[model samples]
Target: MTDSIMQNYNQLREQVINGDRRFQHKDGHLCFEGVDLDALARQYPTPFYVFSEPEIIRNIHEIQQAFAAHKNTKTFFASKTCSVMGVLKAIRDAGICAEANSQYEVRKCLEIGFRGDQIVFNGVVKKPADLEYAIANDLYLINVDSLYELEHIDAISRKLKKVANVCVRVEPNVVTAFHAKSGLDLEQAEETCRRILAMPYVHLRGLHMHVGDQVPESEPFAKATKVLVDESRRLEEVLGIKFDLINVGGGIPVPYKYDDENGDPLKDNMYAGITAQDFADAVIREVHKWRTDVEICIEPGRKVTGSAAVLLTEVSCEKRKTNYDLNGNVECHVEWKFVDAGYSVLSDSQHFDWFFYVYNASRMTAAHDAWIKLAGPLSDGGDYFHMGVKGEEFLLPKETHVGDIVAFLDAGAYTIESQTVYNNRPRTGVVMIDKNGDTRLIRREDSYEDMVKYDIYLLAA
Candidate 1:
């Protein structure tokens, strides 16, 4: 049991009991879609990710249903989030297309049965090889980031004797909580349109715009959609070019922290009740005002896979550190628990200060009354989850002992794709469970041999 001394057991218990609906209690054991997480942990070892097949499908369906009114609207699954072959295949099997940010991601999509026309290639620093592949394969839409990249595409396509289909990504100047360095400002957008019109080998099919990431409400998208339509109209008036596509880049947010009311706290850590349908309605309504012929495309990453899986990490060691309050007076002692998985599993936690809801899977029903420090196994100062919650240290269950399993909820997106071999620790595997209680090995665990397989060996006589 953890040595944390705090007495908010009732409040903490309520929060844990009402955690993410997917990772909830079943027969007194935490289960993901009726499959016991502890049982899977025992069989597959801890420090692995478990994905719910139904949940992934459900997210896809929910988003699709939300935009059902716009039947012409299409969704392209962002491959940069959770690039596991099995996960990608599952998404493809659900009838959603894909979007790739790199040549490797493009190759993976092709290898996984997604056609070139069904994939949207998006990246600011796209490699020449990526441009060559997209140009040669006739991808759905290459969302061009800059004028220089447009020239590269023209050059590459001319070399390959192929016409490159492209979309001009615009920086709409719509302010949001976060901003990405991709896309072009309005002035650059017009220049890009003129240059594309000049290049005989490059075909401009449409315009694309993305405000930022984790956008909680629908206003930015509405404003950004208006910007795209307005820009497309201006380009047509000036350059005599009509675009047929408007790829609004994906930034749909998910509720990661469980303490909020509706899982969407865009500002002030307060609940903001905005749904996918809300954004879709706002966007679709605004785009139609300009022209109804243009097709609307969405590239969703986090909203599709964010809440479909849980990362399980087991406590390997525990320690108590005594603290002194500067005057040579003993102030307090803090308990720290280390799991086999560190920032590698939840990179966004430390890198971006992103918060994820964590709980003791081994003791799901136990009261989370103690304050403790939960961290990863890496030898880094920042390899920890949270310092504390609500003016206290990380509130955890008293039964959180070594060998007990901890699960990070809503970690389906970005975790596996960003996992690293830092500290020589190989990336862990993943498992997927279906509605029929069937389990499949989506990814295989890494072995010590696997870690050193890429290194060169030398022998001296």
Candidate 2:
């Protein structure tokens, strides 16, 4: 590894070293919220997700505080992150609302004590049932992505005899240069906004736009805010419609990596550590410059949930491999270490090419100088951590062996919600430790029966 690569690894490990109080080394073992991870790993099965209630709450309040200056500013926890009942309850109790991407997610939010007006339903391809559910319940806002969705929502609202509160998602076209599929074009969005005006049953709340998630900088949000403000001005001037809400949808970046020795942000990493306050100031200022009476709603999923939990797994096996160049020259052979967890537990690592910090939990402060390939349990055709990012290196303790515990840090976000039984492996359980050091099982792991629960069995019928 080059010096910069080693430097980056060191910076990443610093997150565990002194990044947050939620994770710390207690008596040579990693402990989350004063609860021993090694003990929990021993008591429970490997490849499980563990969350810190205090960390989740802390992240929520921090985002809330950033926008506290605006009385009308509302924050919603993106429920698609970690929809565990306990996790949802903790976020709900933290005074933030909820945002659902699907009808079931909306129902989950409702079932977990979120009020109708406290939730917002958002999706690009919203189904009729989703519209019906949101309308019948009088949800806070249904972000209409297409004019076609407006017709459906209007139909459902008329059937329910309730005016459906709605927002039009404008495809900000902020030029993030990636993940720009959602939302409507400028003309299409304005037309959707105008069409919503004619729908007697649809109450147009305002404009909404999701620039992108894991955005590198605050410029996209600021630019999107400007676009939204400009659209708001046009709607008021041309269409004579005044919007009361403007949602520059959540792309608030979370610092998933640890800072360097001086606790300085890494320049090369996407998360150079921009706080919600920085984003809030950027978008809030731009929108207020155009309209002061509008409410600003932010849907924060990963930013709030990303760093609140870690996945714990055991080193199941290890292998030493030899490498050779195309010219029959020896390149570099590396040690491949397998873990209990796989892409079934962490889809983003494989799907989105995302990276999370992994370390030897048993050797808390030990030097992770050994370069190793960490693979997951599913190796039929595909694997998880061991595959490695195309140009990245996974470093761990040279002393790592079977039964040694490994912790995947900052993985509470999409990891849990995106689990699957790909290789016939059951989904892992989720455990939460509160501020009082109380550990509770938030979700149970899938068993053999559960693994095949949805499958229709046939025995020579």
Candidate 3:
């Protein structure tokens, strides 16, 4: 159905059928069209953000094609992944709608120069402050879930005499495609149902349900649609009007892989599988069957941002735990050399220890059975990586040693946009090149002086 479905092999499988997974490429490399990390790193400095404009464009286009011949099927890029102004501008230039989850996300879409008409703001609790901002800017739609919030919004509009277009964030209680437990389930949706039907003042534009991340099965997604369809008819009959849109929010996973605990190719270890094209087709099939009048929209965050950029962190040090248990467990006590960047710099926004770091330097191919302790520049005890898998902790292999370049595969989604200078580490510079291969270092990394510039302390005079 797609130009061609991509295939991948991993250590394990969570489902019965085998689908092509295009996301599993480079095995651990960034597949950008013309962007060069080594050159960009040298120009902008290490601990920076790098991205692929063409990769993003291709991903968007692939979805568009996968759902071809369907007019109302629109894809919006979720900006929470990589919200850099430069990246937003690139997404706009790529011709995709913007999906914002908060005030700042919407503002970034504006600051990056995307028109207010091109945005869809969805969240569980969109602060009044953010809602007012969206109203002022004329956002396409604001997702509202609670009845109290809807009443407040109506009161605001009646007083201000301005209508705010909004959608009901129905927490669908069905299982989604990927990991059902990981997504929106049935119990949550039941609670939010009555609140959505009662609101008449707000132009209930549509319904949205992002059940979970890394969605596994269409049953959850399809089940969500049935709920929406039934609910839409009931609302229309009650209010005597027809609804216009349905947003099946995104959770499509990329087929990415790294080495195993033993540094063997991770393909031999993971069980998750699904190609982008396969997912797009399944989603379209489910959505198209919903209703003829309803406009179908999808908000894809990870799929669009995950592959557009690559991350490289230099290896800082290696060693075992200083405090060991009688049973030979490391016992959570190990100290090694560190840089400004560590678990704090390279991990998820939640800093949940989900990713790994390696050395992108000389002596990359060397291995030994040595357990190493890793940490960041911060004195915080939580900033450390005790594992040694290629992408999880060390993808460079036993040969993967210090000073070697460690790359984070799907980092384009969060690094430049979400990470904080927890240890007072200065933010890295950002560079964005367009699909035409034009490169620009949109933001400059902080200098040592820059790091200390805003710093102030009070002392007794």
- For model 1, the stretches where C-alpha displacement exceeds 4 angstroms are 1-21, 175-180, 261-273, 324-330
Per residue, candidate 1 scores C-alpha lDDT tens digits across 60-162 of 9878988876768879998888889989988998899999988888899989999988999999987788799887888888888877787788889889988
* TM-score of each prediction: 0.90, 0.91, 0.75
Model 3 lDDT tens row, 1-461: 11111111112211101221322213232223544444445555566656778778877787777666567776788888778777778788888889997898898898887787789887667667767787777777777666656666666655555667777766654434353423233444434444444545456676677755555445655566667666666666656666678777887665444323233222331212444565656656665665665677888887787767655556666655456789977767433544446655565623544442333323222222223344665677776554444322322334445554444455676566555666667777766767677777877776678766687978458
Per-candidate Cα RMSD to the true structure, in Å, reads 3.5, 3.2, 7.7
Which candidate model has the greater TM-score, 1 or 2? 2
| Error of model 1, residue 314, in angstroms | 0.9
Clashes of each: 2, 2, 46
Pull out the clashing pairs in model 2.
Answer: 374-386, 375-386
- C-alpha RMSD in Å of predicted model 1 compared with the true structure: 3.5
- Per-residue error for 113 in candidate 2, Å, reads 0.4
The superposed Cα distance between candidate 3 and the true structure at residue 348, in angstroms, equals 1.8
Residue 190, model 3: Cα distance from true site in angstroms: 11
Candidate 2, after superposition: displacement of residue 382 in Å? 4.1
Compared with the true structure, all predictions reach lDDT values of 0.79, 0.81, 0.59
**Candidate 3 residue runs with Cα over 4 Å from true position:** 1-36, 175-201, 258-272, 316-340, 356-375, 380-382, 390-403, 447-461
Better of 2 and 3 by TM-score: 2
Give the Å error, residue 221, model 2. Answer: 0.9
**Which residue runs of candidate 2 sit more than 4 Å off their true CA positions?**
1-15, 175-180, 260-269, 323-333, 381-392
